[PDB]
Amino acid sequence: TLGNTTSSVILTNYMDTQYYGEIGIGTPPQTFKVVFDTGSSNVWVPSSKCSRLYTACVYHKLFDASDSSSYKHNGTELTLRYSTGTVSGFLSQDIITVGGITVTQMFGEVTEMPALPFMLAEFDGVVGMGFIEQAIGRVTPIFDNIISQGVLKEDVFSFYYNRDQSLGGQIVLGGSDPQHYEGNFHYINLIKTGVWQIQMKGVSVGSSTLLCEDGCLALVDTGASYISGSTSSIEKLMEALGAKKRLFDYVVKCNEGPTLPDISFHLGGKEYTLTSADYVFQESYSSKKLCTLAIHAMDIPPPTGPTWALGATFIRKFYTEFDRRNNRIGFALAR
Template sequence: MALLMQCWVCVITLSLTMTTSHALQRISLKKMPSIRETLHEMGVSPAQLFAELAQKSKDDLSPSNGTAPTPLTNYLDTQYYGEISIGSPAQMFNVVFDTGSANLWVPSYSCSPLYTACFTHNRYDGSKSRTHIKNGTGFSIQYASGNVRGFLSEDVVVVGGIPVVQVFAEATALPAIPFIFAKFDGVLGMGYPNVAIDGITPVFDRIMSQHVLKEEVFSVYYSKDPMHKPGGELVMGGTDPEYYTGTFNYMGTSETGKWEVSMKGVTVGEDMLFCKEGCTAVIDTGSSYITGPASSVSVLMKTIGATELAEGGYTVNCDLVKSLPSVTFHLGGHEYSLTEDDYILWQSQFGEDICSVTFRGLDVPPPTGPIWILGANFIARYYTEFDRRNNRIGFATAV
């Protein structure tokens, strides 16, 4: 069976190489309501729902069984998902392309009925794939709300038209909170191999090994236009000039094997208020908002006159939005500013305008933290290239 699958993939890959060698491969990204927005629509308070889980996260932040927990907030505000297929014939899944992790997991058809979240999503059924190879090794990712557990399998995964033979996880235990509210099925990690659980080779590394990409890079574009279809695009092999103006500015990753860079300060208006002695900034496609140390974000919110909501998050008076200061991140000798248009989200609730601030407080303890996480609202302003070959990240002003 393994030999049959390898032969099948070789044929497909050879065909792809002959027609698209050194080409850009694209995955359309759809923008959907985040888990937090879904909870609001249901009248459920995220703060109440996650208060105990947040405390549990603080208590459990030491690695367990070689697996460090991923903060729950990573996917609370995620809005962008792309489609991949697994197996033959193809079984389709919406996944978050997450630079903060390096494994691929999707819900399994073998998921227990006790885990309701499995049954609100597409599930992989290995028995229906002629290229499925059983592995069976146990798998676990620790989240603040509990573990995503399951077992490993191997099959053909197609991303952006490129097929690879990939080991991935079938999730058989999926915490209801928060995944029952998620619009995505699973997660495809775009991180480095050294952060992959169980030493599994990541999907993007498999793709690079086929030498079908123009360059060993991928770039992420998120449209700022809510009416734009699709909501964004993941481009493998390079960048698309139609998505930016000017040139890219590059800076090396601060730690080999992680999509993070050294930041030299955060300025609000004309005043540098945070990270004066330098800090770490993680460039995270798995988060829609910007997070920083809770104390720093609290000061920032007071500076712009924001009000904290009982259910979590911050709002400002919509009449004052145009007078809000810019927030500037100092990265690699360049300044990357977000205006009020970039960090204020206009929403309507019960017929009234609500202006939400897209900053969140998140304390990550040493040695990993404290950190700032620059998510989708930063990437929407600055088209971002992730360069694996040169271990660097590039930013250009998005159009």
């Protein structure tokens, strides 16, 4: 069912690495800073029921079901395995406020939140923008619940991620905001419904298509800070860029940053190009300092992986529209 409503959620940009918005859970609302993640399908926040020995829980807003008059018990155990770290808890139902829309939602109350990476999170939890097919415990995702209300103008949602005291970013539910892109959208259909993954025809470092020569997978992940490939793809890519491995990232000598070649991603018709300004954290120009790159190795496990993941590094340059109606992703040059 379609209506007229488009709803927007203002995002906060934390150091070009974390982009989060705010949602309200319960009556009265308990507000949480949440990542709107297309790479996952579950909604979750840290629970009041989380032990004060998980230091992550000490530094994040906890959901207290005993303060909500709209809370409905469930209690089913839930383990959400991301490849950066793992969270577990149990299921709860309450009213979720997301940019003007009020939806009764089944979410996870996280009781096991590991310091790594959650002590580094500026966000409290996650709002999964992925499909039911990838929902742990087959829980109806928030977007499907909002689509059911028959209020949205279109069965689409869009991401705008800015570059780091202005607008950090914006999600528009039920359409796109033309103030944030220019030109026209170019769509690439999904390999299959259930995952925001598209076929990638090749990755070129410089003028020559050095990688993904015989085609590969590209997951459009709004919950990811960087553009990621498999350990092997990143090894070849990084050798071509002249980058050194450092444990958690890849660096180049700061002076070498601007001179690095453009990286292009063949998606659908078009070539989506990123210059060294689009992927280097140019914090200095010193030959005596090491500058990190906004491209990391990430081995996503099967069935979704092995795949490339186009995160915030990509979405910054290209405004993204996720079409639930036509099972496709659209890209336009961001403003």
